[PDB]
Amino acid sequence: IIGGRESRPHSRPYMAYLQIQSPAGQSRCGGFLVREDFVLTAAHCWGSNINVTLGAHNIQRRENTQQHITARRAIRHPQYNQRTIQNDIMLLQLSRRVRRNRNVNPVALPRAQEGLRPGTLCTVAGWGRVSMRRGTDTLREVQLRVQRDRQCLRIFGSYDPRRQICVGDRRERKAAFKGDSGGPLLCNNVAHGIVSYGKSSGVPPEVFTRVSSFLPWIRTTMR
Amino acid sequence: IVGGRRARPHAWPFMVSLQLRGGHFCGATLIAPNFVMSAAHCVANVNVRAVRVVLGAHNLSRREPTRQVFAVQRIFENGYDPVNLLNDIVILQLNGSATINANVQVAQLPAQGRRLGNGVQCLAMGWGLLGRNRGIASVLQELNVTVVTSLCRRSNVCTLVRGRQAGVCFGDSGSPLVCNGLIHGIASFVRGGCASGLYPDAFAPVAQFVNWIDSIIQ
Amino acid sequence: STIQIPYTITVNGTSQNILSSLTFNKNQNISYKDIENKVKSVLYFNRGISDIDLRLSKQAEYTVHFKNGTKRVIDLKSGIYTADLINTSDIKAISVNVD
């Protein structure tokens, strides 16, 4: 996370760390607990195997607060287009329910296409890199400001405001970066967005998956 | 070298191996007792202070008493273009002076500007991969080749094993091209992959830099 | 025995915010063709860029960043490979850009 501060430990018990095994490599993403048996994330964080780590703060240690669960199913959205990053949302069916403690519990999802008016101040957290040369072993966070959709319609050729959010003020140097994909965008303690993409410089604005605009598919999949 | 043969032990004493952490990564040519001549891109991205110039080896994998090893002290370029692979030549000054003997000798370079026409017979060499997907060489490999002008530009010397799939491979960069007893080319790049049989391999034209090389080694 | 070299792919002007890394062996010299087949690999797995998309792209290149501060820019639509080897443990990261 570029331009943020370090998180108060376990003050965000919904956060999920994803160890993804791809062909010819690994990948590391974020994610968040939405129910006792499901983690929501982005659809390009998909791989063959996924080690989900809940209730962590320092993931390069092994804390007794942590809980390691492999993912039983990774269900990408059926309209996910990796070329344009469209419908970038994926559900993780955990292989076992979480312990649920004061370090591990789900996060509230919004009501079916709840709005999110521009200027709203939200919070995004994750274990991603903080610059182009340095990273972090502990969970970090930053506060970003939703922009008008025109700011993202200019920059990104496939920005679709019906299913995505435009986040990050052009003038302040805060944004989510490499490794925060799948992490939640949080306004009033409700997961309104999923980290998806931006420009590779980290210069905001950047695009989140609009969680509210996918609620019927989520509940249908959550069975 | 793909599709070649084992070279007579030390039949080419001017042949040089450049190694990083004991591993061959490019060839070179001994042009003077304290100067090797190699490809410019072999040294453009590497820790020059870890490179070790190995003279007069033959079986790179086993202990050879004939070997002499040097570090690189200074580097001399002549306008290398990594975008177009132009002037792919470099001259490395050694941290010492090699002892010329039967296994280590100085190579002969052509006259400035002498260009080889089509059809000339040459000999490519080096410890490059024996075959794409097959592995690095342990014994020096040599290979009769023919100089071509078709599918080539004036800025390079191009060769082609005719009628077979054979040619230079990776790790042959910097290795010399010997024609009529002279180093006419430093191995630069291939097209489509090793030993395509369709696209000639490309050498830096040594004969176009003899003047620049002489001013360096004096 | 093996190492992870991180990479980033930006196609059409957008780059996913994922932390992705390839798998190479510790202290091994490889060729720029070995690297190309792994770049064309994650190009398809991450953002659905096939061989046909490369050929028809406006430009397609990747950049090996070495840990000493130097880099080497490779033209994916060129089909040309310097016959050299580079050591996997010297590579800082790889960046990929396609249009």
From Swiss-Prot, chain A:
Residues 1-223 form the Peptidase S1 domain. Keywords: Antibiotic, Antimicrobial, Cell membrane, Chemotaxis, Cytoplasm, Disulfide bond, Glycoprotein, Hydrolase, Lysosome, Membrane, Nucleus, Protease, Secreted, Serine protease, Signal, Zymogen. Residues 1-5, 77-91 are annotated as: Important for antimicrobial activity. It is an enzyme of class 3 (hydrolase). One of its GO terms (molecular function) is peptidase activity. It is found in: Cell membrane; Cytoplasmic granule; Secreted; Cytoplasm, Cytosol. The keyword Glycoprotein applies. Expressed in neutrophils (at protein level). Expressed in B cells. Serine protease with trypsin- and chymotrypsin-like specificity. Also displays antibacterial activity against Gram-negative and Gram-positive bacteria independent of its protease activity. Prefers Phe and Tyr residues in the P1 position of substrates but also cleaves efficiently after Trp and Leu. Shows a preference for negatively charged amino acids in the P2' position and for aliphatic amino acids both upstream and downstream of the cleavage site. Required for recruitment and activation of platelets which is mediated by the F2RL3/PAR4 platelet receptor. This is Cathepsin G. The lineage of its organism: Eukaryota, Metazoa, Chordata, Craniata, Vertebrata. The gene is CTSG.
UniProtKB/Swiss-Prot annotation, chain B:
Bone marrow cells. Neutrophil. Its EC number is 3.4.21.37. It comes from the Eukaryota. The keyword Hydrolase applies. GO terms for molecular function: cytokine binding; endopeptidase activity; heparin binding; peptidase activity; protease binding; serine-type endopeptidase activity; transcription corepressor activity. Keywords: Cytoplasmic vesicle, Disease variant, Disulfide bond, Glycoprotein, Hydrolase, Protease, Serine protease, Signal, Zymogen. Changing residue 191 to Q: In CH and SCN1; loss of interaction with NOTCH2NL and loss of NOTCH2NL and NOTCH2 proteolytic cleavage. Its main location: cytoplasm. One of its GO terms (biological process) is response to lipopolysaccharide. It is linked to Cyclic haematopoiesis: Autosomal dominant disease in which blood-cell production from the bone marrow oscillates with 21-day periodicity. Circulating neutrophils vary between almost normal numbers and zero. During intervals of neutropenia, affected individuals are at risk for opportunistic infection. Monocytes, platelets, lymphocytes and reticulocytes also cycle with the same frequency. Interacts with NOTCH2NL. Interacts with agaphelin, an antihemostatic protein from Anopheles gambiae. Serine protease that modifies the functions of natural killer cells, monocytes and granulocytes. Inhibits C5a-dependent neutrophil enzyme release and chemotaxis. Promotes cleavage of GSDMB, thereby inhibiting pyroptosis. Promotes blood coagulation. Through the activation of the platelet fibrinogen receptor integrin alpha-IIb/beta-3, potentiates platelet aggregation induced by a threshold concentration of cathepsin G (CTSG). Cleaves and thus inactivates tissue factor pathway inhibitor (TFPI). This is Neutrophil elastase. It comes from Homo sapiens. The gene is ELANE. The chain holds residues 30 to 247 of 267 of the full protein.
Swiss-Prot record, chain C:
It comes from the Bacteria. MAP repeats lie at residues 3-99. This is Protein map.
